[PDB]
Amino acid sequence: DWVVAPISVPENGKGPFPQRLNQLKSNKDRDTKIFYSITGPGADSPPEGVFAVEKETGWLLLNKPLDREEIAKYELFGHAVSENGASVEDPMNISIIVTDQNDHKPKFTQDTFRGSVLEGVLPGTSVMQVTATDEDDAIYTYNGVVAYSIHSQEPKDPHDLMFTIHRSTGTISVISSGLDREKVPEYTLTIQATDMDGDGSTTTAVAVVEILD
Amino acid sequence: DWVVAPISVPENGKGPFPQRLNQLKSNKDRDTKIFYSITGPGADSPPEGVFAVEKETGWLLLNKPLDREEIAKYELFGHAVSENGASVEDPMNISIIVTDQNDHKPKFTQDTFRGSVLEGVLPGTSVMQVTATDEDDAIYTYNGVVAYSIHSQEPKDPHDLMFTIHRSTGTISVISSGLDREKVPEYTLTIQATDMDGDGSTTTAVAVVEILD
Numbered sequence: 227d228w229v230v231a232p233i234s235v236p237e238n239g240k241g242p243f244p245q246r247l248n249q250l251k252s253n254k255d256r257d258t259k260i261f262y263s264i265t266g267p268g269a270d271s272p273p274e275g276v277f278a279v280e281k282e283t284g285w286l287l288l289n290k291p292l293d294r295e296e297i298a299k300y301e302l303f304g305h306a307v308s309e310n311g312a313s314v315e316d317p318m319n320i321s322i323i324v325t326d327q328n329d330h331k332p333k334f335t336q337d338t339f340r341g342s343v344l345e346g347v348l349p350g351t352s353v354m355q356v357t358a359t360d361e362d363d364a365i366y367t368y369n370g371v372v373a374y375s376i377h378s379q380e381p382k383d384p385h386d387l388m389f390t391i392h393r394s395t396g397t398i399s400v401i402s403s404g405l406d407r408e409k410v411p412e413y414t415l416t417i418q419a420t421d422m423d424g425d426g427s428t429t430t431a432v433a434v435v436e437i438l439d
Numbered sequence: 440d441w442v443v444a445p446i447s448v449p450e451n452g453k454g455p456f457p458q459r460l461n462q463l464k465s466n467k468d469r470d471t472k473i474f475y476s477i478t479g480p481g482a483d484s485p486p487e488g489v490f491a492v493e494k495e496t497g498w499l500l501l502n503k504p505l506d507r508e509e510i511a512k513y514e515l516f517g518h519a520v521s522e523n524g525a526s527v528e529d530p531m532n533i534s535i536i537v538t539d540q541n542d543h544k545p546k547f548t549q550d551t552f553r554g555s556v557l558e559g560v561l562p563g564t565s566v567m568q569v570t571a572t573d574e575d576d577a578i579y580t581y582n583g584v585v586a587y588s589i590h591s592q593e594p595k596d597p598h599d600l601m602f603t604i605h606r607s608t609g610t611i612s613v614i615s616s617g618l619d620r621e622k623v624p625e626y627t628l629t630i631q632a633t634d635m636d637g638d639g640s641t642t643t644a645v646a647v648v649e650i651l652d
């Protein structure tokens with residue numbers, strides 16, 4: 227059968243609402259009067275009334291701006307019904323895909339993360355993992371794609387770059403020899419998490435590393 | 440910098456294990472002896488020892504078959520370290536992407552679903568929703584993509600096709616006039632859920648529809 231292609235609707239649209247997405251039509255309408263309707267989540271089950279059809283004209287309408295982070299996709303059936311009350315067609319699948327906007331910044335799961343590591347480890351040893359989440363899409367776009375970096379280390383003894391952080395996983399690793407509890411018992415790493423794979427918004431948190439024995 | 444491209448590894452591989460994925464190498468190895476190592480979840484944090492590196496030869500190894508449904512992606516750092524114990528390189532990102540196998544069939548969330556609908560509704564009214572989940576990937580493949588169909592309706596009074604089911608959402612809708620509690624108080628819809636968007640395995644469950652007043 228000929229069917230509606232999936233309609234892409236960006237989230238957070240400016241209107242005007244209700245907004246026309248597509249006009250539903252059965253050719254049998256030259257022969258008798260046709261009444262259009264839609265079913266499914268978004269239509270007549272929760273969340274109800276997000277979409278509507280104009281029963282005479284067949285206009286599918288979006289009633290309000292959409293949020294991808296709430297529902298990413300709607301699937302409905304359009305129904306064509308005679309003046310009598312009989313179905314004049316098989317129901318037609320209607321797909322609405324909500325495309326993503328970068329409308330969320332990265333949030334660290336806490337403000338300070340505490341970890342520890344033994345005082346004699348060789349470059350290339352995991353210490354701890356920090357996490358920042360972004361609620362936007364990471365599959366089709368970079369909006370939800372977080373890049374981690376160390377902004378600074380305090381203090382700079384024995385020298386500055388003692389640690390590294392995995393850009394995708396926020397795993398912090400020792401990368402230089404020379405950790406010693408007697409000299410330096412604790413480091414503070416200022417961490418950044420930047421969405422759009424490091425081109426979007428930056429958020430900052432802190433990682434405190436205890437040097438053990 | 441030149442870096443390793445993301446390595447695609449299909450889940451459930453037959454071996455031989457440990458399996459060689461890629462050979463890590465710093466050219467500085469003509470000048471001094473180099474020792475290779477890896478950090479991150481999958482390496483030296485949980486799940487540990489899923490991957491390994493041969494410290495002299497630089498061979499990255501997968502130790503055991505993988506399950507996408509457990510972890511879909513690993514990200515590690517490779518480290519190049521001198522005979523002394525000093526880092527001779529910035530750590531290199533290593534991505535392992537586990538590609539999906541259709542190794543799960545659709546499972547209905549229960550064996551029987553109960554719903555109800557008023558006795559006078561017009562074609563195009565939602566009744567209830569049935570759900571079958573598939574644990575395979577629905578993004579990159581159809582393995583986890585469930586298609587619903589009604590296999591049969593009991594009994595066939597006033598006639599057979601009184602209901603329909605949304606192929607993607609498992610929403611059941613009235614599609615014909617004529618429901619009457621006095622004549623028929625309950626229908627049993629035999630439902631199917633077929634993964635690979637209806638080309639894979641079928642599973643069967645039952646939907647019981649009470650005709651209300």
Ligand SMILES: [Ca+2]
Nearest residue numbers: 293294295329
């Ligand atoms: Ca949003």
Ligand SMILES: [Ca+2]
Nearest residue numbers: 330362369421
């Ligand atoms: Ca974002």
Ligand SMILES: [Ca+2]
Nearest residue numbers: 326327329362
């Ligand atoms: Ca968004």
Ligand SMILES: [Ca+2]
Nearest residue numbers: 422423424425
């Ligand atoms: Ca970029």
Ligand SMILES: [Ca+2]
Nearest residue numbers: 506507508542
């Ligand atoms: Ca599996």
Ligand SMILES: [Ca+2]
Nearest residue numbers: 543575582634
């Ligand atoms: Ca499957």
Ligand SMILES: [Ca+2]
Nearest residue numbers: 539540542575
């Ligand atoms: Ca699978």
Ligand SMILES: [Ca+2]
Nearest residue numbers: 635636637638
């Ligand atoms: Ca197909």
